A paper describes a structure:
Strong electron-density peaks were present for the two Cl atoms of DCP and the single Br atom of 5BR, allowing the ligand orientation to be easily confirmed, although it is important to note that the electron density was well defined for all atoms of the ligands. For both DHP–ligand structures one monomer had near-full occupancy, but significantly lower occupancy was observed in the second monomer of the homodimer [Figs. 1(a) and 1(b)]. In this case, the lower occupancy of the two 5BR ligands was automatically found in Coot with a data set from 2000 images, but this step failed with 1000 images. Strong positive density (a 32σ peak) is present where the Br atom of 5BR occupies a similar position to a Cl atom of DCP, consistent with the larger number of electrons on the Br atom. A negative feature is present over the second Cl atom of DCP, consistent with a C atom occupying a similar position in 5BR.
Here, a high-throughput approach to determine room-temperature damage-free structures with excellent sample and time efficiency is demonstrated, allowing complexes to be characterized rapidly and without prohibitive sample requirements. We also examine the challenging case of detecting nitrite binding to copper nitrite reductase from Achromobacter cycloclastes, where the ligand displaces a water molecule bound in the active site. Our results cover several different ligand-binding scenarios, such as coordinate-bond formation to a heme iron (imidazole) or copper (nitrite) and noncoordinate ligand binding in a pocket (DHP ligands), with the latter being highly relevant to the binding of ligands to pharmacologically important proteins such as cytochromes P450.
Author numbering:
A (entry chain B), B (entry chain A): 1 to 137
Write the structure that this text describes.
Amino acid sequence: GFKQDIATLRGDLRTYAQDIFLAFLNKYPDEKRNFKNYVGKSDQELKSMAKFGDHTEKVFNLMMEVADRATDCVPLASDASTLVQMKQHSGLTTGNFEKLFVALVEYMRASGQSFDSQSWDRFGKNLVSALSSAGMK
Amino acid sequence: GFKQDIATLRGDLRTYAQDIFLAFLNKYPDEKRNFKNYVGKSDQELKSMAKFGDHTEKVFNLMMEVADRATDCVPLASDASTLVQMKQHSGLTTGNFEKLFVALVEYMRASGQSFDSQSWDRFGKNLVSALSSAGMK
Ligand code: HEM
Ligand code: HEM
Ligand SMILES: Brc1ccc2[nH]ccc2c1
Ligand SMILES: Brc1ccc2[nH]ccc2c1
């Protein structure tokens, strides 16, 4: 279930973080505009960049912390506030987050592993609603 | 404290995993014998080797999960059994793990960060005891 999925993802954090982020960027090419350093590069080019690996590792680590602290797939309001108030998230809307979790669930369903994809979908939906309640457009 | 230390380490996972493993290998040169392809290399050369980066991250990812699942710095028996039953650990003894945690505690004390080094020392001793009860020589 959800808690085991967190353990599975944390066990190979960098590998999953890169694969999920690339799934997101390739499913929604327009989102790649938020990352000017990654424009014009193939998946294998990005995977060779130390900057890419470090960025995805840090984002995914915090996503796993938020998921681990959630109750019944409902994130803590304080975690949602943190994500809203981050300077790196100025200009972002809840739609950006919604698309990320669509790609994440689609990745889990296609991987063949026994991820609890329904729980991740609910978590994504509750996180979007918590970001709204925390002041994100 | 201990729980916050886990979060700190996970926040810069690749850096700490490599730094701590290198501190271990340089404090205990004999331990490089378990890693034949690491001999004759400086630290920066090791940090460029594919197997080194992948290995240290997977070790540290799982070590933080074991620490996170512990109660009062006592690991779960199931986590100890997992570490003992791993085919990669055949031929290892508790002494290899004891040396790892001496280096980790010394690293924390020399870092100037507010690590709860006393809790990590207890954790290491309690893990070693659990490994022995689970079957490791
Ligand atoms: C639960 C989901 C998310 C979490 C936990 C999260 C967390 C983070 C973290 C920790 C950083 C700092 C990373 C670093 O130091 O390189 C970061 C940066 C950033 N994030 Fe988020 N993020 C999330 C979702 C998103 C989404 C959906 C977008 C855009 C579609 C986004 C856009 C960015 C950008 C543009 C940066 C700055 C990257 C850079 O300057 O290189 N994040 N985020
Ligand atoms: C809390 C302590 C430890 C944890 C969680 C742990 C976990 C792991 C994991 C997950 C792997 C497989 C990762 C991979 O795919 O390479 C591994 C491999 C390995 N570990 Fe452990 N380990 C620990 C302690 C140690 C110690 C103390 C030693 C030796 C002094 C050691 C020696 C090895 C070796 C030789 C391998 C295989 C190397 C290879 O295949 O290239 N480990 N360990
Ligand atoms: Br997984 C993952 C990794 C890095 C990221 N950066 C922005 C969203 C995002 C998701
Ligand atoms: Br951190 C860390 C990373 C890799 C390792 N391999 C054997 C002990 C050890 C510790």
